[PDB]
Amino acid sequence: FILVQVQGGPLLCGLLSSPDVLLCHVRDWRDPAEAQANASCPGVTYDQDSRQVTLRLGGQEIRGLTPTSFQQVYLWKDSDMGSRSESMGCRDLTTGLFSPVDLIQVIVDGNVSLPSQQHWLFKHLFSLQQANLWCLSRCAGEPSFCQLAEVTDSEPLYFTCTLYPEAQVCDDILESSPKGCRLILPRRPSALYRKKVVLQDRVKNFYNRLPFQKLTGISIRNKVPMSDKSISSGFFECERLCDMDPCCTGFGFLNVSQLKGGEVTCLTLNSLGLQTCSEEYGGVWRILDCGSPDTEVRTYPFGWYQKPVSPSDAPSFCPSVAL
Amino acid sequence: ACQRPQFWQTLQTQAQFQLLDYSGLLLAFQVFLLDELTARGFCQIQVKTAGTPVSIPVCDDSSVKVECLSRERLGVNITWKLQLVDAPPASLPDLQDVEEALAGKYLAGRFADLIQSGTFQLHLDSKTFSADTSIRFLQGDRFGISPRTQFGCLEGFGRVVAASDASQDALGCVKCPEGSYFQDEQCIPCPAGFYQEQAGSLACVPCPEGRTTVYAGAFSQTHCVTDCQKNEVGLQCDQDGQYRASQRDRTSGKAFCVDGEGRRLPWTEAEAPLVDAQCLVMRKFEKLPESKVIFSADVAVMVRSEVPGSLMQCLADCALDEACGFLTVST
Amino acid sequence: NIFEXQVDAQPLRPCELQRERAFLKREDYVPQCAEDGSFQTVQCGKDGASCWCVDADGREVPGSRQPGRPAACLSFCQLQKQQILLSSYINSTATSYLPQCQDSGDYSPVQCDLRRRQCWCVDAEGMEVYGTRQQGRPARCPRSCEIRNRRLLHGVGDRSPPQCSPDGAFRPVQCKFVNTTDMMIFDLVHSYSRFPDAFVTFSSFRSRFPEVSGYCYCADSQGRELAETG
Ligand SMILES: *[C@@H]1O[C@H](CO)[C@@H](O[C@@H]2O[C@H](CO)[C@@H](O[C@@H]3O[C@H](CO)[C@@H](O)[C@H](O)[C@@H]3O)[C@H](O)[C@H]2NC(C)=O)[C@H](O)[C@H]1NC(C)=O
Numbered sequence: 045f046i047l048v049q050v051q052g053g054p055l056l057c058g059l060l061s062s063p064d065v066l067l068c069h070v071r072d073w074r075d076p077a078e079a080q081a082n083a084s085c086p087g088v089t090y091d092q093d094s095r096q097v098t099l100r101l102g103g104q105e106i107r108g109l110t111p112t113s114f115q116q117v118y119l120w121k122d123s124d125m126g127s128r129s130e131s132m133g134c135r136d137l138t139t140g141l142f143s144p145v146d147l148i149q150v151i152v153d154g155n156v157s158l159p160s161q162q163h164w165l166f167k168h169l170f171s172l173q174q175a176n177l178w179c180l181s182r183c184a185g186e187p188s189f190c191q192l193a194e195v196t197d198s199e200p201l202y203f204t205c206t207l208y209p210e211a212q213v214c215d216d217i218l219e220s221s222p223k224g225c226r227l228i229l230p231r232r233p234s235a236l237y238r239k240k241v242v243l244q245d246r247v248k249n250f251y252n253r254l255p256f257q258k259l260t261g262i263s264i265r266n267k268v269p270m271s272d273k274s275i276s277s278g279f280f281e282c283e284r285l286c287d288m289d290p291c292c293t294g295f296g297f298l299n300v301s302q303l304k305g306g307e308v309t310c311l312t313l314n315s316l317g318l319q320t321c322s323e324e325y326g327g328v329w330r331i332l333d334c335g336s337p338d339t340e341v342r343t344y345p346f347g348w349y350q351k352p353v354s355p356s357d358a359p360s361f362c363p364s365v366a367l
Numbered sequence: 368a369c370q371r372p373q374f375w376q377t378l379q380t381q382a383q384f385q386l387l388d389y390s391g392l393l394l395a396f397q398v399f400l401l402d403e404l405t406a407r408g409f410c411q412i413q414v415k416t417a418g419t420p421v422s423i424p425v426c427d428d429s430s431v432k433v434e435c436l437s438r439e440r441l442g443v444n445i446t447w448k449l450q451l452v453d454a455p456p457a458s459l460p461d462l463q464d465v466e467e468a469l470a471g472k473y474l475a476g477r478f479a480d481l482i483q484s485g486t487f488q489l490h491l492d493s494k495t496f497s498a499d500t501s502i503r504f505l506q507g508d509r510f511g512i513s514p515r516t517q518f519g520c521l522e523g524f525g526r527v528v529a530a531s532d533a534s535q536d537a538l539g540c541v542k543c544p545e546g547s548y549f550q551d552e553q554c555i556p557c558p559a560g561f562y563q564e565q566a567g568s569l570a571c572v573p574c575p576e577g578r579t580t581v582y583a584g585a586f587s588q589t590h591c592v593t594d595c596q597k598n599e600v601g602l603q604c605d606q607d608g609q610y611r612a613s614q615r616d617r618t619s620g621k622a623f624c625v626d627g628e629g630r631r632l633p634w635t636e637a638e639a640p641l642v643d644a645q646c647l648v649m650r651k652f653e654k655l656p657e658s659k660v661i662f663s664a665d666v667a668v669m670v671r672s673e674v675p676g677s678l679m680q681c682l683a684d685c686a687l688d689e690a691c692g693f694l695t696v697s698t
Numbered sequence: 699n700i701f702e703x704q705v706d707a708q709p710l711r712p713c714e715l716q717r718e719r720a721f722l723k724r725e726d727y728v729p730q731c732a733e734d735g736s737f738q739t740v741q742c743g744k745d746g747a748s749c750w751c752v753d754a755d756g757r758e759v760p761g762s763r764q765p766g767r768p769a770a771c772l773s774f775c776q777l778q779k780q781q782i783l784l785s786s787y788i789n790s791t792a793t794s795y796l797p798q799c800q801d802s803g804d805y806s807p808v809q810c811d812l813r814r815r816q817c818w819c820v821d822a823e824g825m826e827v828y829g830t831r832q833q834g835r836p837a838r839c840p841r842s843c844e845i846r847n848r849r850l851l852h853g854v855g856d857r858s859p860p861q862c863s864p865d866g867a868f869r870p871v872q873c874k875f876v877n878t879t880d881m882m883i884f885d886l887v888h889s890y891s892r893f894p895d896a897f898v899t900f901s902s903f904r905s906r907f908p909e910v911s912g913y914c915y916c917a918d919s920q921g922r923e924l925a926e927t928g
């Protein structure tokens with residue numbers, strides 16, 4: 045049954061029989077500015093549109109008679125849902141956007157802070173084929189949040205479809221390969237699918253090159269080798285990779301391992317840390333960190349680039365990073 | 368409240384002329400007239416310096432106001448406002464030099480001649496709106512034939528001296544303080560439930576949804592307060608500003624527990640101190656008045672668990688039963 | 699006059715195209731163009747007997763034609779403001795953007811929507827510089843030489859980065875390299891990144907690139923090569 049109490053209004057008490065998808069969990073990142081028209085998750089909507097708050101719970105809309113606070117569903121776990129006589133008077137173009145993830149790469153630390161959106165697809169009407177398609181289609185419908193979609197069948201009544209943002213965590217080593225980068229998920233997933241990154245034709249930000257040559261305490265989001273490209277093409281890709289990451293604050297386009305000849309590398313960052321060693325200053329008197337000979341960040345167009353400074357902060361689901 | 372006064376920050380002159388349909392959106396004509404004024408250089412002051420001439424802007428989006436007086440004759444208000452921080456002190460040393468640059472042959476005398484001539488017309492989709500030869504100047508509620516300047520304050524600064532006696536006192540502007548916002552030449556205290564921390568602001572930041580301000584004119588984030596903390600009846604509060612579950616009376620050491628709201632639950636008042644953890648379980652039960660109870664045969668749980676050394680404990684047994692629906696206690 | 703070295707299509711603006719075509723046909727009206735290639739807001743006629751104002755496309759604004767030079771013509775920023783406001787009155791449209799003009803009449807480098815919610819950088823012709831739209835006023839709008847350099851990295855144009863002033867404008871003297879063998883512009887952006895040590899001296903440069911010669915010229919404010927200065 046569903047129980048609803050709009051703030052200082054009537055109290056609803058819906059009964060449920062054979063639900064298909066429980067959909068909104070108290071702990072889900074919800075889009076802060078999301079149109080109520082687009083099937084906004086919390087059913088309540090149009091508070092005082094004409095002094096009436098419509099409720100679109102279940103499949104049935106209450107008229108709206110309301111002058112919110114509590115809203116919960118309850119489930120009979122040991123239900124006869126899948127095994128019930130019908131006489132009791134009851135009642136593929138998107139799978140190509142994703143690529144399976146080798147579950148081994150996942151590290152399982154239950155304590156990680158990772159926003160998500162949970163769903164329960166009940167097994168009495170969902171086959172594993174359909175559940176994998178419902179979950180993937182829903183991830184592709186949330187283009188601002190979902191990068192990963194995992195499906196689990198470790199429960200007797202329902203499949204679990206939880207959508208994640210990017211879960212990859214890297215170390216701060218300036219290297220061309222993602223070997224110190226791991227996926228950290230709270231639980232072992234039966235199947236983990238990653239949306240394939242699609243590069244738009246044009247760049248969306250006019251990035252500013254930092255005057256500083258040395259960054260301390262950076263936070264890296266991804267490491268991509270670019271040595272199989274022209275320098276112009278690699279820079280163009282590095283710009284559009286930071287465009288696709290809502291948590292990216294800037295990128296590095298640089299040669300790493302310069303003592304062995306250098307490797308062209310793109311590093312997307314969600315924190316620039318402490319920026320030092322400007323070429324404009326420290327001419328006669330330098331005190332801060334300078335002179336890293338295993339890295340080449342000076343020659344055009346190498347450098348550290350910043351996404352343009354805006355007073356609007358990153359999406360709330362982005363990881364918290366501090367010096 | 369008490370702040371440092373500042374000097375007058377702006378100078379202002381106003382003229383009126385008439386443009387020669389109704390019940391329509393005239394605010395388009397406010398932009399069109401400003402564009403025509405800008406095109407002919409009546410929104411800049413040009414100062415004949417030695418080398419490069421500095422340009423002082425004397426208009427904004429509020430400079431032109433139009434009202435409909437009669438058919439085919441619109442009424443136009445033009446207001447030139449000079450900010451003194453833009454007037455070059457090397458070219459206009461005294462404030463008198465600034466007044467005459469704003470109300471003389473380079474701005475207002477040059478505009479009166481243009482209107483009196485008859486050569487001001489506005490081009491709007493092949494239609495022509497020529498202006499009448501009559502021009503009037505505000506002189507403090509008496510439209511005269513000569514421009515008079517009027518002193519004022521900047522955007523974030525409240526007036527403290529009346530307009531009329533600006534000739535008497537030079538310090539007429541104070542910055543709106545930390546508890547305040549600016550509207551309409553006055554500094555108005557943040558209303559209750561709102562706070563502002565930085566002076567010279569245009570709005571009041573609301574408190575977090577769980578908190579409010581006890582009085583008006585709050586001037587810090589910490590001044591936003593919860594219902595528990597504002598509480599004056601002595602109820603103690605935990606961190607995060609939530610009511611402490613366990614309470615003790617002011618008069619007597621008698622101890623009681625309160626709900627999520629500050630309502631003091633009866634029937635939990637006991638002489639023995641109650642630890643907060645003891646009130647949490649009792650907060651999850653409700654005591655039924657006799658009118659809701661019927662005395663007749665039913666069936667009792669047969670739990671034979673280690674018998675205590677106790678209502679507080681007895682409730683706790685039900686609180687973890689998962690089958691107990693309710694219980695009764697004897698005397 | 700501008701005439702670039704290697705390009706097949708000259709970067710001529712519409713006024714400069716209409717001016718050249720008219721001078722060729724010995725018409726009595728030849729459009730007058732600004733140094734950057736825009737129409738001058740005042741367009742004279744044969745001998746200047748009659749003069750009128752025009753919009754950004756050279757179309758005569760009605761009612762402006764006059765014997766003698768018009769006293770004042772609205773700039774292109776101001777003329778765009780009129781056409782937007784009339785449009786809403788003529789054809790109901792809830793405007794979301796009204797251009798902001800400097801007191802000289804040109805477009806303000808930063809342009810904000812009426813909600814003051816989104817802002818972007820425009821060039822000297824009111825056209826949005828791509829990638830500059832954001833929440834709030836952009837801290838620093840890029841200049842023309844910096845924009846040209848960034849678009850070069852995105853595959854637009856030749857591979858020779860123009861030299862920019864500290865303010866971000868074009869330097870008046872522009873220098874590039876020409877491969878004398880195939881008579882093509884030398885790929886400077888990639889050669890400099892891969893061989894920075896070949897650029898220490900001209901001895902080291904011509905050791906690595908023996909067939910490459912220098913080509914310098916005078917550039918206009920848009921970085922275009924002035925004719926017959928190479
Ligand atoms: C960043 O790293 C890249 C890749 O490691 C560097 O590009 C490489 O540069 C070297 C030398 O400049 C090229 O090696 C060869 O040098 C000999 C001279 O003995 C020359 O005869 C060859 O034709 C060749 O140039 C190497 O080809 C080149 N690799 C690529 C993929 O372009 C680059 O120099 C580094 N950038 C900086 C600023 O250090």
Ligand SMILES: *[C@@H]1O[C@H](CO)[C@@H](O[C@@H]2O[C@H](CO)[C@@H](O)[C@H](O)[C@H]2NC(C)=O)[C@H](O)[C@H]1NC(C)=O
Nearest residue numbers: 381383432433434435442443444505508509510
């Ligand atoms: C144009 O300016 C005149 C003079 O400032 C305005 O007339 C004043 O209007 C206020 C508010 O209605 C009155 O309190 C004053 O008594 C008026 N003064 C005079 C001398 O009439 C007029 O309202 C302005 N028009 C517009 C459209 O702003």
Ligand SMILES: *[C@@H]1O[C@H](CO)[C@@H](O[C@@H]2O[C@H](CO)[C@@H](O)[C@H](O)[C@H]2NC(C)=O)[C@H](O)[C@H]1NC(C)=O
Nearest residue numbers: 877878879880881882884885906907908909910
């Ligand atoms: C200058 O242009 C000539 C083209 O005429 C380049 O020489 C050619 O180089 C390619 C390799 O990229 C060879 O396949 C051709 O056989 C070469 N042609 C000749 C005629 O030798 C030369 O490399 C260019 N120089 C620079 C510095 O770019």
Ligand SMILES: *[C@@H]1O[C@H](CO)[C@@H](O)[C@H](O)[C@H]1NC(C)=O
Nearest residue numbers: 151152153154155156157230
């Ligand atoms: C994570 O936190 C939980 C409870 O807060 C704890 O049981 C667990 O040991 C923690 N994991 C660690 C410390 O690795």
